[PDB]
Design a protein around this nucleic acid. Sequence first.
RNA 1: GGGGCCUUAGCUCAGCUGGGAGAGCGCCUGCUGCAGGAGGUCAGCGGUUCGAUCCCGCUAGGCUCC
RNA 2: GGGGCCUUAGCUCAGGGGAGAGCGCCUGCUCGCAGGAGGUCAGCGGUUCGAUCCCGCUAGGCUCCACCA
RNA 3: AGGCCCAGGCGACUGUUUAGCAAAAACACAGGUCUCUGCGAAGCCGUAAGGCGAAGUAUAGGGGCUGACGCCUGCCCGGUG
RNA 4: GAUAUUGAAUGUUGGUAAUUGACCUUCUAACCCGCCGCCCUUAUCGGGCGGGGAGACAGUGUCAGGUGGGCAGUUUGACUGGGGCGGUCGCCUCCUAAAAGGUAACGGAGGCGCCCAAAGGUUCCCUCAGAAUGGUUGGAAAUCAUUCGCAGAGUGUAAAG
Lengths: 249, 49, 52
Amino acid sequence: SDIYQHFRKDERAFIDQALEWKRIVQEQYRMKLTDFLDPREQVILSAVTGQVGLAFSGGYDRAERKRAILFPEYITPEESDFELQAFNVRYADKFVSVDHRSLLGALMGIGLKRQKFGDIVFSETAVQLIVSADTADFVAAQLTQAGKAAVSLEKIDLSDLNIVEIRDDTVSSLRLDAVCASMSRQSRQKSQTLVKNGLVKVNWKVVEDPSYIVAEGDMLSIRGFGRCSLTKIEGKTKKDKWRVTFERQ
Amino acid sequence: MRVNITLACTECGERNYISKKNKRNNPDRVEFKKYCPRDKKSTLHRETK
Amino acid sequence: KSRNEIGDETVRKLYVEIMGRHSNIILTDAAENVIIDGLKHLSPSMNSYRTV
RNA sequence: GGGGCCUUAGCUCAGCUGGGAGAGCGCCUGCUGCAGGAGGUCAGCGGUUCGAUCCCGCUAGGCUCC
RNA sequence: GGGGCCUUAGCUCAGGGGAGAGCGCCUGCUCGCAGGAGGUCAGCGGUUCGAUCCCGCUAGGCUCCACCA
RNA sequence: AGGCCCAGGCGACUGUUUAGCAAAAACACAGGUCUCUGCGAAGCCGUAAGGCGAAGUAUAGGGGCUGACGCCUGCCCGGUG
RNA sequence: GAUAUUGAAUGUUGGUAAUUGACCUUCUAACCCGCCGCCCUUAUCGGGCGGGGAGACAGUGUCAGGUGGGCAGUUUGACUGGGGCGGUCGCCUCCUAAAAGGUAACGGAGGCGCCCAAAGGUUCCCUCAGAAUGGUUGGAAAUCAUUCGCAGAGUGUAAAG
Ligand SMILES: [K+]
């Protein structure tokens, strides 16, 4: 009841369900695997669960959408308890190209919910996707086209997964509106519109406060400029602006 | 920057000599052949660790 | 039909009045019928019926 | 009291520091917004000189200034 | 009056090593591209191997003081 | 045994105040609001016992600010509480 | 908050070899009642007795941390053409400084709070600035070569010597 204040009002929905997962693992003494919780929902769950222990794995290390195991003080989990299936996306690579937008659009097009798949990995040699094992056969059967490319899915082990723009700058403050303006190369008044409407996120939390102070190692997500990361804050200049470093995706 | 140091007779262990070096210029333990008045002869005296 | 700063679709009306001396080009919001700006301003002192 | 600056058309001020009295606004005219009108001893008075708001003489008045 | 701070390209700001970056403005190309435009680095005189970034002064703009009889 | 009138500032008003240089525009005020307080109330005095609060009980009691009445009382929760 | 006053049980979870911890709930008998009845007793005190409530909590003691101008003791520099404000406070060099030395002012100018493992020691050897004249790049100015050349250079760094 006195947890919601710490999160947003829309985020209440997840928090209610996150409390219902903790309820199970305490009383029934059994691990609860979840449906690839979003990077934000990782942060929320971590809080709602409390310290019921928690584990998280999205197949490869550095998956955005990862599935969480809520386990007690015993039954420390394995890599396959997360019920993850990796696939290699086969297509006529010489003729057609698959991009992240097309493959994401195709996954959604076959009716797959965002919670039923993790990250879509693009390397030089392979395009791979990670899904929940319960949906693996459905996705393999239905995902026959991505954009203009005819595609097929080959099952692989997680071990077979084939896993910047540094921009040293100065800002007046570490307010959100100031950092966005700097990163996105805009007027601050324009950046304030972005923040206020609800287009910027900070670690996948929608921050609508222009004056929110941004810390070192915060993934900002300006809808319109993509995504960028305050990696370094490096003291202050002669004329008193924060020496900073940005790295766009 | 430049720091205080002790040299110590590598024989008898007698902390015989303070001095100064620049650490950036001289980052590894300096040694010199300076008289130990315990031993009563020149010995190598190395910067104390 | 244009987009706003957030990316939402907005419709603007551009009125081009050919009235000699009083000719004007006026941009409005289509939803609110509110003048964004006009190439020539018309104060209430100049015209009691309509302000631009 | 002492210094300082201006007085100009209906109104308000330009005009180089003599080179030949103007603008804006208002007003009067016709047109359909336009041009075109009027209007001054350039505060007044009298020297300079080829012409003087213009140069100086010579008095108003108001401001600047302690 | 005194102190304290400021003066960089159109605009916003980076920056003892020979003055940049974005945006605007121009180049051709149709939400990104592709090269330009533009600087007495307030000024001055000097420290020196070179000064936007030393140092001393002059501007100007802000800021804080100018009290006690 | 009242001088009166016109106009303006301040305070609504009657009250109160620097005994002995200040009576006021200062205080109070009725009204407003905020806040604490479930009763061995909070608050306060006292080391405590014992008290006030109250022989009261949230329409009550304490504290802060505001000050009749009329119209009203905007923006800012980063800082501090 | 720990600990004493402070007990009994039931669970559950530690750690030692069945005892001792931790926490949850329950209990009543300590403790508490500014509740009721009865008595001491003509008594809104107090005490006793019996109910009831609450209960090992609270309260109180010791110890600990936090908060704490509510209160207490204090501190809050000197120079200074009055004090405040500004500036300054130790060290080095020069000038003032009156041809020994010393010498004041909120007198005139600058430095310092290091640096260097060689920029120290010694041995041997050497001579600098700049200019003229000639030179592919190459220019006033890089690199040669020639002549001239008390130093017009250099001496880690301020200045003087
Ligand atoms: K004096």
